[model samples]
Target: VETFAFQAEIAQLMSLIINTFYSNKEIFLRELISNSSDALDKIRYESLTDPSKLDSGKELHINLIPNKQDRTLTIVDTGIGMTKADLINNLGTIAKSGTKAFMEALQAGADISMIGQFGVGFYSAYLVAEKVTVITKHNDDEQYAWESSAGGSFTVRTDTGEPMGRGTKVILHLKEDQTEYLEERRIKEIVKKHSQFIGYPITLFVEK
Candidate 1:
């Protein structure tokens, strides 16, 4: 038996980022897409070490799909998939968020910032989505998907798919006022803003 841990103040910091710093609210979509691009970058770079590191079957890209019937929108990605622990560490804390790390790099003479800060970007999706789901397949595990209302707690379980080549798909259950965000131009604007600086491809899947 050994130990498991994290830095102190991390949970508190996550709470601060989640509950604050996003007064605008509409930026959630941009944050999530920015995160997707960052994940793609990690897998892409790893591919250089082991070509098998990336999902050969998956193309590197991001997409947005909206469902008019249910009044929902989804932002999907083909990038780094998370393991169970990856999900816990990521979804659990925000002070050490992936998005924050990305920002730190940009500010540290690194010259770039992506959406996947420490990991707080995903939570921003909740600003627009009353409900959300993540369907992902890691090259290392069977395809698994998770869902949550994110009302203080979340639920994660397996998904029924042939397995995404290797990446994540985010389904956003939009709010009444948020339907406008379903537009292609709107989605594109946010992506290009926070993510043009990102190093990957992004696409869209709009509602019919």
Candidate 2:
């Protein structure tokens, strides 16, 4: 477990943010899916100068797999995956901007106002899940997995699953009372409401 010293300070702030905006636990799906859309957008934008990054015929899409037996929900995308540093920088610290900026902002007094800069969206997963796992692969680095429980520390290590080539897979182990996320119809409704306009195709897999 990698302990980020600053995480303890933001624990309360993050709890506040989640309570205020993500009180409706389903909002976790929206926040995560939006991040995936942004990930897809970044690669598309980068491919303009480097066509090599755009592997031919790779459809930019998101996949949702809901497993009832395991009581888990997974959201995957064929987008730019995170490197080791990316995982640590994004999850170990407060957000994608790193703990430095987050600490500065917290000290600056606009703690809530600078949320986007702090990367609180990802933490929305905890609103519904007891634990969250992110498995990702990038051409620049080997595949890796990051796990956390919205706590003071997180763990990161090499991924054990079959290679992902280039993309991210987020698995949410739902809390006992949050199994509604495992229902295909419910997921579809939430997706349509929050992500119908997303750039990539979002597919849901049930009966698995």
All candidates: CA RMSD (Å): 6.1, 4.2
Alpha-carbon lDDT, every model: 0.65, 0.75
Winning model by TM-score: 2
| Cα lDDT tens digits for candidate 2, 1-208 | 3544335545655455445543367767887888899888977888889988867326688899999998889999988878888777654453534434655665676544344445666766777887888899887888888886765567888877788878899999988988999988899899988777888888888683
Q: Per-residue lDDT for 160 in model 2?
A: 76
Where does candidate 2 have its weakest 10-residue lDDT segment? 91-100
lDDT of 1 by residue, 1-208 (tens): 1123333333333344345434466667767877788778878887888887754454788777877777878777888788766654554554454545645554565422233444555656766677777888777776766766543445566677665778888888886877877777876777777667666666677555
RMSD of 1: 6.1
